Amino acid sequence: ELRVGLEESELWLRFKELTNEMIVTKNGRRMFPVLKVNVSGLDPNAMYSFLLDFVAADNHRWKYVNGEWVPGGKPEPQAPSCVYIHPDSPNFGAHWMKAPVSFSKVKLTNKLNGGGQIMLNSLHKYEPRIHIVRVGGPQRMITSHCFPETQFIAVTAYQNEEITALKIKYN
Ligand SMILES: CCC(=O)Nc1nc(C)cs1
């Protein structure tokens, strides 16, 4: 059985208990914390690609109102985000299982852009999600996994200074 675990959940949970925020920019900003995933149970000899996308956790616009994030009352449907390919892809199971799979090079943007960068909507809440795609073999297979601990709101600047302080403390 394929097992997927979040590395450094301790730390992600401190961010989550404050409501996490991630900066987006026109050129694209790397994430802190970085999503790092522990994977066991792959076929060491099989070929896999690791994909990352961001699910819109709800259909609302969020605003920081007197020190608290509060959703709007005008939901719209959220078009799915684009998919980031881990740059190690494609690779052997052995490769993926020998150390945490670290998405350190994904950049989050607010503007339709060349590529690589993943466009999010500012002030929407997102739940990171990976797809593990068995490639090249006879049977294509996909295993997906969400990381609730890693939820955040996309922001053009930090609103909650407690988030600002944690980001600096741990970076
Ligand atoms: C799952 C398919 C896959 O790995 N796609 C890739 N495309 C590029 C360009 C690198 S890996």
CA angle at 108 for the pair 103 and 113, rounded to the nearest 5°: 120
User: 3-state class of 61 per DSSP?
Assistant: coil
- The count of structural domains within the chain is 1
Experimental method: X-ray
- Declared resolution, Å: 1.6
**Best probe residue, ligand 1, of 50, 89, 131, 141 (max atoms within 8 Å of C-beta):** 89
Q: Which contiguous run of DSSP H or E holds residue 129?
A: strand 125-135
What is the C-alpha to C-alpha distance for residues 110 and 155, in angstroms, rounded to an integer? 9
Question: What distances in angstroms separate CA 81 from CA 66, 108, 117, 151, one per listed residue?
Answer: 30, 11, 11, 14
Q: For ligand 1, what atom is nearest to the CA of residue 49?
A: 4
DSSP string, 158-169: -S-HHHHHHHHH
Ligand 1 shell residues, CB under 6 Å: 49, 85, 89-90, 133, 135
**Helix ranges, 24-138 (H):** 93-97
Distance of alpha carbon 137 from alpha carbon 36, whole angstroms? 26
Q: Which domain holds residue 71?
A: 1-171
**Cα-Cα-Cα-Cα dihedral sign, residues 19, 23, 160, 60:** negative
61 vs 36: CA distance, rounded Å: 28
**Residue 99's CATH number:** 2.60.40.820
